[PDB]
C-alpha cells in the first residue's frame, strides 16, 4: 500500500507499475504505517 502526497489518496502499487497517483498524477508517494502494531523491547 501507499498514499498520495497532495490528496492522500489510498493507492496500491505493484513492482512494475509507474510511481504516480491516479487522481492527481503527482510523482511523490508516501508509504503507510504498519497496520499490525508490533510490540518491542528497547535493549
Amino acid at each position: 500500500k501507499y498514499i498520495c502526497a497532495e490528496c492522500s489518496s489510498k493507492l496500491s502499487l505493484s513492482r512494475t507499475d509507474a510511481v504516480r497517483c491516479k487522481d492527481c498524477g503527482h510523482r511523490i508517494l508516501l508509504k503507510a504505517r504498519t497496520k499490525r502494531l508490533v510490540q518491542f523491547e528497547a535493549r
Binding site: 502526497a5 497532495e6 492522500s8 508516501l30
Partner: protein, 70 residues
C-alpha cells in the same frame, strides 16, 4: 508544543489550568500577575511554567506532514 503537564521543580500540576488561565486574560481583561495568582500558583516556579510558555501547537496544526517546501 502543548503545555507541560507538571512543574519541573515542585512537582505540582499546571497542565489543566492553561485553558482557564487563557480565559481570564481577555474575557476578564485582567493583568498577568493577578491572573497567575488567581489559580493558586504561588511559588514563582509555577508562575515561571505558565508565564513563559510558547504555544507552538497552533502552527503545526494548520499544516500537514507531507509537502513542506523550502
Amino acid at each position: 508544543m502543548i503545555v507541560p503537564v507538571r512543574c519541573f521543580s515542585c512537582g505540582k500540576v499546571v497542565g489543566d489550568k492553561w485553558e482557564s488561565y487563557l480565559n481570564l486574560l481577555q474575557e476578564d481583561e485582567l493583568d498577568e500577575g493577578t491572573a497567575l495568582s488567581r489559580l493558586g500558583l504561588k511559588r514563582y516556579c509555577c508562575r515561571r511554567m505558565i508565564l513563559t510558555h510558547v504555544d507552538l501547537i497552533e502552527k503545526f496544526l494548520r499544516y500537514n506532514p507531507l509537502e513542506k517546501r523550502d
